[PDB]
Amino acid sequence: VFGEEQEALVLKSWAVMKKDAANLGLRFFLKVFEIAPSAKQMFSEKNPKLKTHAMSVFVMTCEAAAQLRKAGKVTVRETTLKRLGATHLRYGVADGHFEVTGFALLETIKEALPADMWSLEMKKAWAEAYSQLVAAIKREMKPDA
Amino acid sequence: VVFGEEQEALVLKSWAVMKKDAANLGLRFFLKVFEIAPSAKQMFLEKNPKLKTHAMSVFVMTCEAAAQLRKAGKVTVRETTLKRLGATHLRYGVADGHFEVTGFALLETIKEALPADMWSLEMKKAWAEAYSQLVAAIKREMKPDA
Ligand code: HEM
Ligand code: HEM
Numbered sequence: 357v358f359g360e361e362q363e364a365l366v367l368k369s370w371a372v373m374k375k376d377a378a379n380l381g382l383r384f385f386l387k388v389f390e391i392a393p394s395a396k397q398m399f400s401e402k403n404p405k406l407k408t409h410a411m412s413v414f415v416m417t418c419e420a421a422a423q424l425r426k427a428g429k430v431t432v433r434e435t436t437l438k439r440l441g442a443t444h445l446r447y448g449v450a451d452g453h454f455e456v457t458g459f460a461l462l463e464t465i466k467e468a469l470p471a472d473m474w475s476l477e478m479k480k481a482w483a484e485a486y487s488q489l490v491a492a493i494k495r496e497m498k499p500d501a
Numbered sequence: 502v503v504f505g506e507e508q509e510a511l512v513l514k515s516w517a518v519m520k521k522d523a524a525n526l527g528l529r530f531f532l533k534v535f536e537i538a539p540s541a542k543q544m545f546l547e548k549n550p551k552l553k554t555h556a557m558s559v560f561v562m563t564c565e566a567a568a569q570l571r572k573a574g575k576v577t578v579r580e581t582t583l584k585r586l587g588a589t590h591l592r593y594g595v596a597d598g599h600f601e602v603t604g605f606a607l608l609e610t611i612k613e614a615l616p617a618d619m620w621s622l623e624m625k626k627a628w629a630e631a632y633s634q635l636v637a638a639i640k641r642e643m644k645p646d647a
Contacts, residue, residue, distance in 0.1 A: 446642075498592065499593060
């Protein structure tokens with residue numbers, strides 16, 4: 357059901373935000389830690405691993421949006437998901453963490469994006485792709501049945 | 502202490518004896534497990550081959566842990582990987598106490614299957630150490646690298 361205009365809303369804003377990714381990712385993380393400071397204990401500033409992770413969140417969320425247009429479902433490489441599941445299960449990432457991060461995602465997009473690009477339609481588009489990505493990763497963080 | 506030649510020989514020799522009744526062995530093994538901790542069943546009755554396949558892996562990999570602890574200073578990635586094992590047991594919610602119950606059940610099952618003549622405090626220790634060290638390696642990939 358994810359439309360072209362939905363996929364487009366994600367892609368066109370990404371196109372703009374990836375021009376300042378390093379600071380984008382930093383804002384992304386400062387916001388996560390402001391809501392839930394305890395989540396800093398999972399990692400261990402300009403930490404380039406933090407940059408890489410933030411960008412991963414954004415890039416794969418764009419890919420899930422692409423994949424929701426096409427197959428109407430997240431079609432990420434099965435071994436990438438399984439790996440994803442295991443890493444996040446390994447570091448103790450629970451539902452709460454995925455949610456706070458999704459919330460921080462939307463607020464970081466708002467803050468960083470030109471005011472004239474932000475809307476309810478775009479909010480929802482990023483919220484859907486991100487949720488569907490999280491659902492798939494969660495699926496590999498539990499027994500398959 | 503220090504898994505050397507003697508401890509290996511005890512495990513290998515005993516395993517060569519028990520191997521002959523391995524089907525009945527593994528079933529008895531996990532029945533004890535479920536008897537001590539019934540809640541453990543929900544992570545996966547006598548007739549289920551997937552249960553037997555699992556009990557076999559425990560015995561066999563413990564036996565292999567024995568050979569590598571002696572030959573290389575520690576347990577190894579042979580038949581699958583530590584990271585794979587870590588990730589599977591994590592994904593099914595297996596805690597320290599589950600590993601421990603299974604080890605107790607292991608030694609209990611070995612003592613029941615072996616000739617009384619072969620059982621000893623030293624034999625007990627050899628299997629306990631090789632199992633303890635395998636579990637330790639597995640748990641290492643159920644957490645982040647310190
Ligand atoms: C859908 C959202 C997310 C995506 C796409 C994502 C993606 C990734 C990727 C690609 C890795 C690299 C590890 C590997 O090669 O498997 C990773 C690692 C990690 N993620 Fe996530 N992640 C997400 C959400 C989260 C959340 C919500 C948390 C916790 C608040 C989190 C915590 C971690 C931790 C602690 C690591 C390990 C450290 C590292 O690789 O540098 N992730 N994530
Ligand atoms: C050192 C001891 C043990 C060894 C060597 C071992 C080994 C294995 C192996 C080889 C697998 C197959 C999947 C894979 O390749 O990752 C597996 C699966 C599994 N193990 Fe263990 N395991 C051990 C202890 C335990 C304990 C204590 C429990 C729980 C009481 C347990 C529960 C499970 C479960 C639930 C699965 C998944 C089975 C399925 O999906 O049908 N294991 N184990």
